[model samples]
Target: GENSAPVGAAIANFLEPQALERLSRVALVRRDRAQAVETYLKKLIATNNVTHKITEAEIVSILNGIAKQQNSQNNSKIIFE
Candidate 1:
């Protein structure tokens, strides 16, 4: 059978070993949901006309912020169960 793990395959292929290792500790969410978060982030960056490269710490902060927004949008419901 062909490999069906989409996000895992992506991580293995594209991300650095250390990055994949770090991200492995975190759970992967659905693609559509992730895309939603990315959309929100991109819009914010575009609106602010952010040009400089964001630090890893800032990336983590932005991801946390987006996750919080998703939770509030969903009324704290569990997703991707």
Candidate 2:
């Protein structure tokens, strides 16, 4: 449960700026939350343990599945107040 925090928050105690910088590269500079999420998800799916070339279709399928699951959990919502 220790790592169950925002990646940004988790490393904020120490290398906050650097952690932010690295995360920022994978994050959307604009108001593109989906892009940031997609980038992070792609990073997560990168397999160092396997030799393979994953296609865009495969990644899109995975993203679609993630979106579907999130939708089912009512987790897909805009963070607007």
Candidate 3:
């Protein structure tokens, strides 16, 4: 996916659970990986609180990386469109 969000927005705003849920669904992330997703989101929130300039693409790449790992664990062949 592309970076569609405004660059100046707070990174924490983009890492809310609802945002993560949407991203997970798009990336085909497994439900079982919710813990991992939340954990990563928390880390991102902390980073955002400190730096405050995270981009949408950064968030997407992190979630996509997690989704890829989850797919590998399940031996799934799904790829992000």
Best by lDDT: 3
Residue 79 in candidate 1, Cα distance off native in Å: 28
Candidate 1 segments whose C-alpha is farther than 4 A from its true place: 1-27, 30-37, 73-81
- lDDT (tens digit, per residue) of candidate 2 on 1-78: 466655543323322344345435534543243353434544544434233322444434544554555444643375
TM-score of each: 0.37, 0.28, 0.35
Q: On lDDT, who's better, 2 or 3?
A: 3
Error of 1 at 19 (Å): 7.2
Ranking by lDDT: 3, 1, 2
Q: What residue runs in model 3 are displaced by over 4 Å at the alpha carbon? A: 1-18, 24-29, 44-49, 53-56, 69-81
Superior by TM-score: candidate 2 or candidate 3: 3
The residue pairs found clashing in candidate 2 are none
Better of 1 and 2 by lDDT: 1
Worst ten-residue run, lDDT, model 1? 7-16
- For model 2, how many clashes? 0
